Design a protein around this ligand. Structure first.
Ligand SMILES: CC(=O)Nc1cc(C(=O)O)ccc1F
Ligand SMILES: [Zn+2]
Ligand SMILES: [Zn+2]
Ligand SMILES: [Zn+2]
Length: 572
């Protein structure tokens, strides 16, 4: 129990017994915590509890030191000293924000705002506390035992009574029993088991509650600016392809860490891989939270970098199918592509952390702890979607509060900005540029004249909380008959249930706005479904319409976002 204070690093025997993470608190700051919160249990080698037999006094403000032992007001000897006095809690080696992080339930937006505006040590305390809270919340759900196997992709479930049911969507990954991880979608239920094992009747699934490890490394290392490119060796033979990024690659070598805001289709993956061509001797570790983001970096590297110097790091618990074209699990390769949670303990000349809006401060810290690099590059877009915060139910999380990197990008601005969108028709670029990019995003493509909008509220039904709008899907069906080229479109909506219905009625491939992030398609059909805060969220709206390379049909519910759309309006 010998440690350093989470608020002023002073060595202490004291560690708050009422905090879920039991943080070490020094004498002077353990006091401010206990005297202004419900937290009154103080721990040491021997905790602060009345030593008298059968006494239940554990509140440090009601305890005293009687020689070498502790007692309450009823058991103390005449020569005793209160543990709480003169703004201190008695201990060896003798705050409003810390109190809020230590006591909050993580269901309010203001809890995440604070977890991002506090000191660096408090950012790690908040991240550790939040993740531990998110995990103890998984224990708080109902178990599902298999009743009958219908076919190879459909089954029927019997749920635990008296305990709430977790959301049936592609946002909750169960763990069957040890039959591998399983997922569920909209009595006919759809089963997506990662391991192809015939779901035996009787076997059960349970949500993967994993232990929350302590954070040590900061979310962002201290920033250093250099006068020359440091530890990196540039090429004078850089292909014209990557010529536009030379000044930004140099900026990368002249700073400890750099932020790159790249709107959709502005060249983030091209920049990340071109940085390897600009410093061809540099060992680069490419990291992101999801397997999809790591795989998209692998795809771009396959085109520009030598395959024998690349390696895809895949964990022993190989959860889903990922990139198969690099030598698997060779940690020593010049180019290492691996997700944040599977990162080995290694060093690099550059670490590239892609899709930074999806990172949490927990992820940021983990990367700083497993990777010791000369340079760190954070690539993403605060105008895109953040990681879902399962506990957050009240208020909206603004982009400046997604993580430490997003906070910098939204407050001081990003170090580098990719200003030309090359993917989208100009109608889409013009709309999102004005919506979330302060008119700084430019279109490379001309208008496609294939970007349409229809204002149609329809009828909103629900499958628990996931929404469905059958009339909006009906309008899409009518549109498809009159527009056969749209037969190849991807159907996108903010709700899994809407997508399940559209898959059956339209036969189009389906994506939620959140799973479409990072992907692109020629044609996109978007139904807004509802006018909720979820479906009207400007970041989600931005991701949704920026998936299209050629055309987009938007069936809207919200007048505001419909009027912003610089698309041709349709009637019916
Ligand atoms: C290859 C690729 O990803 N495309 C791309 C390249 C540039 C550029 O050459 O500046 C800019 C934006 C882009 F989306
Ligand atoms: Zn302290
Ligand atoms: Zn506490
Ligand atoms: Zn007592």
């Amino acid at each position: 129990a010998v440690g350093a204070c989470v608020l002023c690093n002073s060595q202490t025997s004291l560690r708050c017994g009422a905090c879920i993470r039991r943080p070490f608190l020094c004498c002077k700051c353990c006091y401010d915590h206990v005297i202004s919160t419900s937290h009154k249990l103080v721990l040491s080698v021997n905790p602060y509890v009345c030593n008298a037999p059968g006494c239940d006094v554990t509140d440090v403000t009601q305890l005293y030191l009687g020689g070498m032992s502790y007692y309450c007001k009823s058991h103390k000897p005449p020569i005793s000293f209160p543990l709480c006095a003169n703004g201190q809690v008695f201990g060896l080696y003798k705050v409003t924000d810390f109190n809020a992080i230590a006591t909050c339930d993580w269901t309010n937006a203001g809890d995440y705002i604070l977890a991002n505006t506090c000191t660096e040590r408090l950012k790690l305390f908040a991240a550790e506390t939040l993740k531990a809270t998110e995990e103890t919340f998984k224990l708080s759900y109902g178990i599902a035992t298999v009743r009958e196997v219908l076919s190879d992709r459909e089954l029927h479930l019997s749920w635990e009574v008296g305990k709430p049911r977790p959301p049936l969507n592609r946002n909750y990954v169960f763990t069957g029993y040890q039959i591998g991880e399983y997922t569920f979608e909209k009595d006919a239920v759809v089963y997506r088991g990662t391991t192809t094992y015939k779901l035996n009747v009787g076997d059960y699934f349970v949500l993967t509650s994993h232990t929350v490890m302590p954070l040590s490394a900061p979310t962002l290392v201290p920033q250093e600016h250099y006068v020359r490119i440091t530890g990196l060796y540039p090429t004078l033979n850089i292909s014209d392809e990557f010529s536009s990024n030379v000044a930004n690659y140099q900026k990368v070598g002249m700073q400890k860490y750099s932020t790159l805001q790249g709107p959709p289709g502005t060249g983030k993956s091209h920049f990340a891989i071109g940085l390897a061509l600009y410093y061809p001797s540099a060992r680069i570790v490419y990291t992101a939270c999801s397997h999809a983001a790591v795989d998209a970096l692998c795809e771009k590297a396959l085109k520009y970098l030598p395959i024998d110097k690349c390696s895809r790091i895949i964990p022993a618990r190989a959860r889903v199918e990922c990139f198969d074209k690099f030598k698997v699990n060779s940690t020593l390769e010049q180019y290492v592509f691996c997700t944040v949670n599977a990162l080995p303990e290694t060093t690099a000349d550059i670490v590239v952390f892609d899709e930074i809006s999806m990172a949490t401060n927990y992820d940021l810290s983990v990367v700083n702890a497993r990777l010791r690099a000369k340079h760190y590059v954070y690539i993403g877009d605060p105008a895109q979607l953040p990681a879902p915060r399962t506990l957050l139910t009240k208020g909206t999380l603004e982009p400046e509060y997604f993580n430490s990197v997003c906070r910098l990008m939204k407050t001081i601005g990003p170090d580098m900005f990719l200003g030309t969108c090359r993917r989208c028709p100009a109608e889409i670029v013009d709309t999102v540029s004005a919506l979330v990019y302060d008119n700084k995003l430019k279109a490379h493509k001309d208008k496609s004249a294939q970007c349409f909008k229809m204002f149609y509220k329809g009828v909103i039904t629900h499958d628990v909380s996931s929404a469905i709008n059958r009339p909006q899907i009906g309008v899409v069906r009518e549109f498809l008959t009159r527009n056969p080229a749209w037969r190849k479109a991807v159907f996108i909506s903010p709700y899994n249930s809407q997508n399940a219905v559209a898959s059956k009625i339209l036969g189009l491939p389906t994506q939620t706005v959140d799973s479409s992030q990072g992907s692109e398609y020629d044609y996109v059909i978007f139904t807004q479904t509802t006018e909720t805060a979820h479906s009207c969220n400007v970041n989600r709206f931005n991701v949704a319409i920026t998936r299209a390379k050629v055309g987009i049909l938007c069936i809207m519910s919200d007048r505001d976002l419909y009027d912003k759309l610089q698309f041709t309006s349709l009637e019916i």
